[PDB]
Scaffold this active site. Structure first.
Site, PDB file in Angstrom:
ATOM      1  N   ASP A   1      -8.528  -0.768  -7.875  1.00 18.88           N
ATOM      2  CA  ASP A   1      -7.840  -1.199  -6.661  1.00 18.88           C
ATOM      3  C   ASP A   1      -7.315  -2.643  -6.761  1.00 18.88           C
ATOM      4  OD1 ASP A   1      -6.828  -0.827  -4.085  1.00 18.88           O
ATOM      5  OD2 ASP A   1      -8.773  -0.475  -3.140  1.00 18.88           O
ATOM      6  N   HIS A  19       0.832  -1.212   0.000  1.00 18.57           N
ATOM      7  CA  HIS A  19       0.000   0.000   0.000  1.00 18.57           C
ATOM      8  C   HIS A  19       0.871   1.269   0.000  1.00 18.57           C
ATOM      9  CE1 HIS A  19      -3.653  -2.491   1.205  1.00 18.57           C
ATOM     10  NE2 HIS A  19      -3.985  -1.908   0.051  1.00 18.57           N
ATOM     11  N   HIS A  33      -6.349   7.497  -2.765  1.00 16.10           N
ATOM     12  CA  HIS A  33      -7.162   6.453  -2.095  1.00 16.10           C
ATOM     13  C   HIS A  33      -6.473   5.664  -0.952  1.00 16.10           C
ATOM     14  CE1 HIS A  33      -5.343   3.222  -4.394  1.00 16.10           C
ATOM     15  NE2 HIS A  33      -6.088   2.319  -3.764  1.00 16.10           N
ATOM     16  N   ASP A  34      -5.128   5.577  -0.927  1.00 17.36           N
ATOM     17  CA  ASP A  34      -4.455   4.854   0.151  1.00 17.36           C
ATOM     18  C   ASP A  34      -3.454   5.722   0.954  1.00 17.36           C
ATOM     19  OD1 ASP A  34      -5.720   2.392   0.468  1.00 17.36           O
ATOM     20  OD2 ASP A  34      -4.537   1.426  -1.091  1.00 17.36           O
ATOM     21  N   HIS A  68       1.434   1.499  -5.767  1.00 15.19           N
ATOM     22  CA  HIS A  68       0.044   1.049  -5.827  1.00 15.19           C
ATOM     23  C   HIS A  68      -0.869   2.208  -6.276  1.00 15.19           C
ATOM     24  CE1 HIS A  68      -3.674  -0.915  -4.597  1.00 15.19           C
ATOM     25  NE2 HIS A  68      -3.889  -0.001  -3.651  1.00 15.19           N
ATOM     26  N   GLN A  76      -5.554 -17.395  -3.306  1.00 12.24           N
ATOM     27  CA  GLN A  76      -5.644 -16.582  -4.526  1.00 12.24           C
ATOM     28  C   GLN A  76      -6.846 -17.065  -5.358  1.00 12.24           C
ATOM     29  OE1 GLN A  76      -3.366 -13.895  -6.048  1.00 12.24           O
ATOM     30  NE2 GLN A  76      -3.649 -13.738  -3.832  1.00 12.24           N
TER      31      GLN A  76
HETATM   32  C1  LIG Z   1     -13.327 -13.010   0.723  1.00  5.41           C
HETATM   33  O1  LIG Z   1     -12.680 -13.803  -0.267  1.00  5.41           O
HETATM   34  C2  LIG Z   1     -11.377 -14.113   0.122  1.00  5.41           C
HETATM   35  C3  LIG Z   1     -10.790 -15.209  -0.497  1.00  5.41           C
HETATM   36  C4  LIG Z   1      -9.496 -15.577  -0.172  1.00  5.41           C
HETATM   37  C5  LIG Z   1      -8.798 -14.843   0.779  1.00  5.41           C
HETATM   38  N1  LIG Z   1      -7.499 -15.240   1.158  1.00  5.41           N
HETATM   39  C6  LIG Z   1      -6.356 -14.794   0.495  1.00  5.41           C
HETATM   40  C7  LIG Z   1      -6.469 -13.637  -0.452  1.00  5.41           C
HETATM   41  C8  LIG Z   1      -5.845 -12.473   0.302  1.00  5.41           C
HETATM   42  N2  LIG Z   1      -6.096 -11.184  -0.299  1.00  5.41           N
HETATM   43  C9  LIG Z   1      -7.036 -10.299   0.194  1.00  5.41           C
HETATM   44  O2  LIG Z   1      -7.868 -10.403   1.096  1.00  5.41           O
HETATM   45  C10 LIG Z   1      -6.909  -9.151  -0.690  1.00  5.41           C
HETATM   46  C11 LIG Z   1      -7.607  -7.963  -0.646  1.00  5.41           C
HETATM   47  C12 LIG Z   1      -7.299  -7.025  -1.621  1.00  5.41           C
HETATM   48  C13 LIG Z   1      -6.350  -7.283  -2.590  1.00  5.41           C
HETATM   49  C14 LIG Z   1      -5.665  -8.492  -2.638  1.00  5.41           C
HETATM   50  O3  LIG Z   1      -4.714  -8.836  -3.618  1.00  5.41           O
HETATM   51  C15 LIG Z   1      -4.314  -7.723  -4.456  1.00  5.41           C
HETATM   52  C16 LIG Z   1      -2.883  -7.935  -4.895  1.00  5.41           C
HETATM   53  C17 LIG Z   1      -5.150  -7.577  -5.714  1.00  5.41           C
HETATM   54  C18 LIG Z   1      -5.976  -9.412  -1.657  1.00  5.41           C
HETATM   55  C19 LIG Z   1      -5.416 -10.742  -1.425  1.00  5.41           C
HETATM   56  O4  LIG Z   1      -4.519 -11.266  -2.083  1.00  5.41           O
HETATM   57  N3  LIG Z   1      -5.172 -15.296   0.667  1.00  5.41           N
HETATM   58  C20 LIG Z   1      -5.023 -16.362   1.556  1.00  5.41           C
HETATM   59  C21 LIG Z   1      -3.764 -16.907   1.739  1.00  5.41           C
HETATM   60  C22 LIG Z   1      -3.590 -17.955   2.628  1.00  5.41           C
HETATM   61  C23 LIG Z   1      -4.661 -18.477   3.326  1.00  5.41           C
HETATM   62  C24 LIG Z   1      -5.921 -17.941   3.145  1.00  5.41           C
HETATM   63  C25 LIG Z   1      -6.092 -16.882   2.269  1.00  5.41           C
HETATM   64  C26 LIG Z   1      -7.441 -16.292   2.078  1.00  5.41           C
HETATM   65  O5  LIG Z   1      -8.396 -16.750   2.708  1.00  5.41           O
HETATM   66  C27 LIG Z   1      -9.380 -13.748   1.399  1.00  5.41           C
HETATM   67  C28 LIG Z   1     -10.668 -13.369   1.062  1.00  5.41           C
HETATM   68 MG   LIG Z   2      -7.954   0.633   1.154  1.00  4.63          MG
HETATM   69 ZN   LIG Z   3      -5.480   0.233  -2.605  1.00  9.62          ZN
END
Ligand SMILES: COc1ccc(-n2c(CCN3C(=O)c4cccc(OC(C)C)c4C3=O)nc3ccccc3c2=O)cc1
Ligand SMILES: [Mg+2]
Ligand SMILES: [Zn+2]
Ligand SMILES: CC(C)(CO)n1c(=O)[nH]c2c3cccnc3n(-c3ccccc3)c(=O)c21
Ligand SMILES: [Mg+2]
Ligand SMILES: [Zn+2]
Lengths: 323, 323
Positions: A228, A79, A117-118, A83, A280
């Site tokens: 975003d 962030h 925004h951030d 970004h 992911q």
């Molecule tokens: C609500 O649906 C879900 C689905 C999956 C996850 N999640 C993730 C994604 C993490 N994440 C963000 O919560 C996020 C928010 C905003 C941007 C972002 O990635 C940006 C680079 C685009 C990202 C991101 O990677 N990674 C994990 C890694 C190991 C173990 C569990 C998880 C897990 O449950 C979370 C929310």
């Molecule tokens: Mg934010």
């Molecule tokens: Zn952002």
């Protein structure tokens, strides 16, 4: 309390000209700013000039704004300033491809909101600040960080020779601050699900009225989320590298909880790093794909975003299966 | 293999009578057992008899159980026999104040689980045993110590003249071992955060029903955590002294990491003793206060716990301020 830029910083920006090769690339949705760090402030100026015009903002006031905005972005893994310019670029690409869909007061505000925004991100979630009763959670009960980002934007514009929106009437000025306010609050991902819900039903039932302000603000909100998350729309090696950056930030937050005796959620836990490919796939399927799908339905020229999202999902799907 | 008590040990316990003065103090939540070391095994017997009756267990078998449990608690700074009896006392006080909410079988099991919840503690965290691949981490992948504590409880009951539940029907006996299993696993603090969050949610939406076994097991779990942390509910000088004991144990663990080169987290670092007041404030705000708050919401007679927790938080608040 803010962080103003030096005379040196804005003067050099004013002198910068974008290399002719990158003129083609900057128009494409999958464009990575990554290899051109020295050009990022210069890239924002170009986008502002190519969209709204060379005489929309006072070049001096604009360059001071950008360089002061850059100084209020911390050295956090994801962030960060990088970004803020990636998000803005995606907004530029969307606003270019839907040129007559938004007013010049929306066009100006949308790019500025994306760069801001951030602002002042400390690499911590709204949940973290609320759970540890941080002074920022005391000011803003909900969308904690997003309300702080908007407050810092307003504070930068309130600086001497920084008010780039000073040439507008009191009515036109309060209108754009509201466009920015709403666009930044919309970057709180928790609000997104409901927004893409209401937008899905509105599209299906044909009730989405672009002349209705309430309906208008919902599309801008989704546009903000799509921008975003645009890291999932870049080419695979770029996408892969960015994932590492947001995890590094998430893991550092988890480490802070572990130090206090608290167990972080798997996502914030670096000892569950092997769970990232599945995480992911879950994020792409539950957040990213729904987002771009609805965005394409409302603004069809934004189709390449959904296309590149799908391509990366397939890549994560391959990682899980062991290629 | 286990550590059996001597004939002398259990015989003296059977002869012990509680002083009439203490009868009123033991009923209070803020009661410090600390000054009555010789009476701790005798105090557990009393609590057992006042909670489930005088004919719930065979006095001989009960006294042998208690005295052998005592022998399987190591001479570690905090996770010792004194802790077991403190946790059990708090459980007794909770059971007493909410008597009819629980079954005679849960009262039997929860008090026994509280006396056994830290059996054979070596003064090391689950995080430690896992990172340094200790044989115990090879047996139990998650809640490492807690699964070992349950295994040692079962081993004590498996001793000659130690099976205190032998007089229960095969159905009652297997239900009480499961009450104990779940209660001890629940003492793994990592599991607590999810448990608290789920229970808070269930209370807010009014979906919580003590007649729902799944809900019941979640409340018992929180009751276990509240009892496990009761040191923060005692009067300030007692609370302050106990903090010194857990830190002596944590520092010893950090020392073990420093010997292998690895840098401990500040909490486990004795060269970082200044960060302790802030660490406490963080623990009270993120762990202790949420715990007692939810516990009071589910079982309102347990409010003195939350009251005394707040009083100690204010004390740590004063230490930080230089008061
Ligand atoms: C609500 O649906 C879900 C689905 C999956 C996850 N999640 C993730 C994604 C993490 N994440 C963000 O919560 C996020 C928010 C905003 C941007 C972002 O990635 C940006 C680079 C685009 C990202 C991101 O990677 N990674 C994990 C890694 C190991 C173990 C569990 C998880 C897990 O449950 C979370 C929310
Ligand atoms: Mg934010
Ligand atoms: Zn952002
Ligand atoms: C409650 C106590 C002992 C108060 O002094 N305390 C503290 O100050 N920090 C901590 C603490 C800090 C971090 C992790 N666990 C902690 N636990 C803990 C340990 C094992 C099982 C369950 C909880 C405490 O009892 C405690
Ligand atoms: Mg324990
Ligand atoms: Zn314990």
């Amino acid at each position: 309390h803010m962080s103003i830029c030096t005379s040196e910083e804005w003067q050099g920006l004013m002198q910068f000209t974008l290399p002719v090769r990158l003129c083609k690339e900057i128009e494409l949705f999958h464009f990575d700013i990554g290899p051109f760090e020295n050009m990022w402030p210069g890239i924002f100026v170009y986008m502002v000039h190519r969209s709204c015009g060379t005489s929309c903002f006072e070049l001096e006031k604009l360059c001071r704004f950008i360089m002061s905005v850059k100084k209020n972005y911390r050295r956090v893994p994801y962030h960060n300033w990088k970004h803020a310019v990636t998000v803005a670029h995606c907004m530029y690409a969307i606003l270019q491809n839907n040129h007559t869909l938004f007013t010049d007061l929306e066009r100006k505000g949308l790019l500025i909101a994306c760069l801001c925004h951030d602002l002042d991100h400390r690499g911590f979630s709204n949940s973290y600040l609320q759970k540890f009763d941080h002074p920022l959670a005391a000011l803003y009960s909900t969308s904690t960080m997003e309300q702080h980002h908007f407050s810092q934007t307003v504070s930068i514009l309130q600086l001497e020779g920084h008010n780039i929106f000073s040439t507008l009437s009191s009515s036109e000025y309060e209108q754009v601050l509201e466009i920015i306010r709403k666009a930044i609050i919309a970057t709180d991902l928790a609000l997104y699900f409901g927004n893409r819900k209401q937008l899905e039903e509105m599209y299906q039932t044909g009730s989405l009225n672009l002349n209705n302000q309430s309906h208008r603000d919902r599309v801008i909100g989704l546009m903000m989320t799509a921008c975003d998350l645009c890291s999932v729309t870049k080419l695979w090696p770029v996408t892969k590298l960015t994932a590492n950056d947001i995890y590094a930030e998430f893991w550092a937050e988890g480490d802070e909880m572990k130090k206090l005796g608290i167990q972080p959620i798997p996502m914030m836990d670096r000892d569950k790093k092997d769970e990232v490919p599945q995480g992911q796939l879950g994020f792409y399927n539950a957040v990213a794909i729904p987002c771009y799908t609805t965005l394409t339905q409302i603004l069809p020229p934004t189709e390449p975003l959904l296309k590149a999202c799908r391509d990366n999902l397939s890549q994560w799907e391959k990682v899980i299966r062991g290629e």
